[PDB]
Design a protein around this ligand. Sequence first.
Ligand SMILES: CSc1ccc2c(c1)N(CC[C@@H]1CCCCN1C)c1ccccc1S2
Ligand SMILES: CSc1ccc2c(c1)N(CC[C@@H]1CCCCN1C)c1ccccc1S2
Lengths: 353, 353
Amino acid sequence: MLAKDKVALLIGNMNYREHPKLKAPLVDVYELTNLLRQLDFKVVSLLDLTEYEMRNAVDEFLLLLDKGVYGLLYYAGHGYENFGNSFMVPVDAPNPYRSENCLCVQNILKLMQEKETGLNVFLLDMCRKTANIVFGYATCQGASGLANGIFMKFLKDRLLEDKKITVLLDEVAEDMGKCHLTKGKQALEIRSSLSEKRALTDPIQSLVRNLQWAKAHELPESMCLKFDCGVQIQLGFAAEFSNVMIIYTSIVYKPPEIIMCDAYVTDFPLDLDIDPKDANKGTPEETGSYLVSKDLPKHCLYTRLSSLQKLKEHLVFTVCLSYQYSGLEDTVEDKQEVNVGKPLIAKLDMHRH
Amino acid sequence: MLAKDKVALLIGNMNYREHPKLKAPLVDVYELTNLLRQLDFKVVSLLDLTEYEMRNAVDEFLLLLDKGVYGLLYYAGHGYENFGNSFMVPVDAPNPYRSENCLCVQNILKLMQEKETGLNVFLLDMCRKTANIVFGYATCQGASGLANGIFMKFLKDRLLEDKKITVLLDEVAEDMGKCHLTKGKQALEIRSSLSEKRALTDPIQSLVRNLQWAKAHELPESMCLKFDCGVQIQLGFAAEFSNVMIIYTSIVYKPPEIIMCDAYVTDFPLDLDIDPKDANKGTPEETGSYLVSKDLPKHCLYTRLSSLQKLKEHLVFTVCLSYQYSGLEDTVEDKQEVNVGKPLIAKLDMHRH
Ligand SMILES: CSc1ccc2c(c1)N(CC[C@@H]1CCCCN1C)c1ccccc1S2
Ligand SMILES: CSc1ccc2c(c1)N(CC[C@@H]1CCCCN1C)c1ccccc1S2
């Protein structure tokens, strides 16, 4: 009934290059993260991961699976099923699906079986297809303002109960059976080898791994930049996921001369695919972050750094003023370079194995 | 919470020609049969089945798996595991194991998935290796007077509870985890796709299949044979399994002249491998039947017809007197032929598909 440690990996794929884009992963990952954080889990929550990235993530999660620890692996995205095998489809995989570009569940399972963990939860919320392993395999992605998936809708309600994981997983499967969409088709399949009364609400009693997590989720301190013209800018930061950071720009001081100005953030490194057409927005929802206008200050300009695991070099970006007073007809610009270092998951380079 | 019908198939392999003989199947099958009979299940309980027999049994069980019925399939014997596949080993299979001679679990499963049954329980007690399918896969055969297997030891206690099958299967897995032999190794693995509150204790509310079961388990009426010398013999019958019948011979009348006699049963058809060295025993335990001396009359001679599914032709056997009085020095014999018809499972010929 006790855990040596509690570590979880959460993968959500929402933006496919060559397959249909998915809406549910973002909320399910965010919501399940904070819920496991409540259960004292050192969670890594990653969005829109490629083949090589996914592979590196899992291997790194598997390394933490020492004797008596509690592992949780949640994947929400596209799935594939060929010759009784199932695969987790990454964002880079081309259409049609091919196994060489995907992650075989059966293999992940084979590696998990070679473990001495007191509990290991393998959750899959797939679309369009003793180690004490508790395998939960859902097949429904037909999901307020924001979309929550059918599996998570029920998983969240029961996740905080002090009952055996298999008992909750069985109740969530029946809960789905009461719902109209999930009664028609049997989306949930459970596979257990759990010999003891192990729950997700179980205390821990080696805390060096807690310090390694803190190091992996360090957000840059709020910075202020003074410009030649006099205007002083505020640079704020917020964490959304392990690989997703929101950047905000506000104006602290404006002299009576300046009638219109706003600091824009640009020239982010090439490795992260951020298109200027989706940055420096009016509200943070426009990006769009799970983070709502209320938890971030109003009158700012927002930019979301979606892919941080691609940060090979220290974060360097330029900020522009774009200030014009009605007296003069032409718009003027002044710019300066900022170094934010290696934020969040970017600290540990995703490269390589 | 209701069943269209409740049908179960129980296979136990206890006497291997080319692999180690097993002791537990006999009690587990007998004990689980009567327990499911209590739960209003039309059970067929078969012992020591070959390749072709096993294959025919399963197919015939699968044909009963119509919409909303409750199926239960219990196999206790040797198992085999090659390339992630598991196999049920029949009695005729040679050593080493070969798949062509065995029954792939994965295939049985594939066929079960093509069903509309309200519940389908697949139990396996293997050694030395929506359809609402509840797959229970045990791997421990290191089992009063008679041996009861580790899985059954706990399965029987919980089998009569009005709780969801998956909940009981989870409790039996934990019960095993409390036991010393079953805590060391994780023998039980559960796989469920059960979306609704379906239990083995569930009422039925099409009863033509009940009449077909009765027909399949008709035992021959107790017969008496009068001999030329005067001595009258009693021929009794008892059912042990669907394919296993106990035959008993007693003496009703003996004139004052006869000082020693006993009716021996012989010349049973060749298809059933009964060796005279194991027939006409002092007590029924000597055969040995699960049936104890107390439920059958004392002072009889017992013969067990182990394999009845091999009965292609009406049961014909000869009975001999073997009577000698101390006055005369030589032992005399008189014999007559008896037709018992097609008893128990022998009524429906196991041949062929
Ligand atoms: C601490 S709590 C925690 C829980 C889940 C993950 C995780 C950390 N990390 C950091 C893993 C460390 C980093 C240092 C070397 C050894 N590894 C195993 C990951 C990192 C990269 C991809 C996926 C994951 S999964
Ligand atoms: C009635 S209740 C019941 C429960 C489990 C079995 C069973 C009957 N029978 C008789 C099956 C009938 C006989 C007539 C034709 C259609 N079939 C499907 C078997 C017979 C032979 C091998 C295994 C089995 S399994």
